[PDB]
Ligand binder design. Structure first.
Ligand SMILES: Cc1cc2nc3c(=O)[nH]c(=O)nc-3n(C[C@H](O)[C@H](O)[C@H](O)COP(=O)(O)O)c2cc1C
Ligand SMILES: Cc1cc2nc3c(=O)[nH]c(=O)nc-3n(C[C@H](O)[C@H](O)[C@H](O)COP(=O)(O)O)c2cc1C
Lengths: 175, 175
């Protein structure tokens, strides 16, 4: 139960679950919570998971360049990502560096009008009424390069493992 | 609509959902996500909501005094609390100050041994095998004094409001 194979298997399962978030609108990994260091303490919010790569150790989100979270990352790129997956009895906590890249205008062109329109409205969080900004370039990628995965497995008894770059081997820790 | 009436009702809805969270184990508000400032960037994790007071604008969690989250809060009391409630189409983000208080020893006396063990044994996060920690009085209250609530209502289209202590009146903001 404690073997290296089990640890490896548990990490593979975590990445499998991220993968399901990219494929299934109804899975909890569809909607991870991203924390940033904000202007007066930590801040967090839901995003849609767009892509995941176990090999590259990345998770990808899309966001509005004009939004506060992007300003937070510009000043401090250190982020954390969380999912609670109760049907699988798994909590996943990840530490990452968030990198900001331009969005794919081919994807932007495929977005529904409402989504397209929302990237070109007021700055998110601005008190209404407010002026819009028709800049399609607001469409932005957040590529989160994971450095740590802490996974709690709420079986009997609880088990918890932590995996850290660069080794990513995994160690059992006390819940 | 965008009336004062709708604004007031939306914050009432938030507090009713926190209420459900204390009472119903299967409700998403049972398990909100708490963000802290950690040792190297932001951190977050799931806790169990134990109590909520609309009148005092507080949320209460129980935790192990020896856990890292407590150490985080010792260095920086600013925290954020998040719940995604898909069935209500609500995301709630709350800014708070966390106070760490002793637990009620009469309640600790009344907990099952499975529950009591959440506050015994090794220091959470310690690599195994881990020595039991002998600190007295590890059963701890984490009281979050809320200062701002940012509510996103994922209607078609979305509406979003921000409410601020001590009056909690609200303003509409851009999603
Ligand atoms: C279910 C759901 C999905 C969301 N998906 C995204 C998203 O993918 N990108 C994004 O920028 N915001 C998304 N949001 C909105 C954010 O949670 C947030 O309100 C907004 O991005 C502002 O965050 P900020 O003020 O920290 O920048 C989503 C919200 C909900 C609850
Ligand atoms: C469903 C569930 C409920 C949890 N409830 C609590 C709890 O209320 N108190 C607590 O300290 N940890 C709770 N945890 C475990 C924490 O999420 C976390 O692993 C532990 O408290 C350590 O956090 P820290 O390392 O930042 O201190 C819960 C985890 C799961 C997913």
């Amino acid at each position: 139960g404690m073997s290296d194979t089990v640890l490896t298997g548990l990490l593979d399962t975590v990445w499998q679950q991220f993968g399901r978030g990219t494929k299934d609108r109804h899975h909890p990994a569809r909607h991870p919570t991203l924390a940033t260091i904000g202007t007066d303490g930590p801040d967090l919010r839901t995003l849609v998971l767009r892509a995941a790569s176990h090999a590259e150790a990345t998770l990808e989100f899309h966001t509005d360049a004009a939004s506060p979270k992007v300003a937070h990352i510009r000043r401090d790129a250190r982020v954390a990502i969380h999912i609670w997956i109760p049907k699988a009895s798994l909590q996943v906590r990840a530490k990452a560096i968030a990198k900001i890249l331009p969005g794919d205008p081919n994807l932007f062109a495929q977005l529904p009008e409402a989504a397209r329109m929302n990237y070109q409205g007021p700055v998110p969080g601005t008190p209404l009424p407010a002026e819009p900004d028709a800049t399609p370039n607001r469409f932005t990628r957040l590529i989160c390069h994971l450095s740590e995965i802490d996974v709690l497995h709420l079986t009997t008894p609880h088990q918890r493992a932590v995996y850290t770059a660069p080794d990513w081997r995994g160690i059992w820790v006390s819940p």
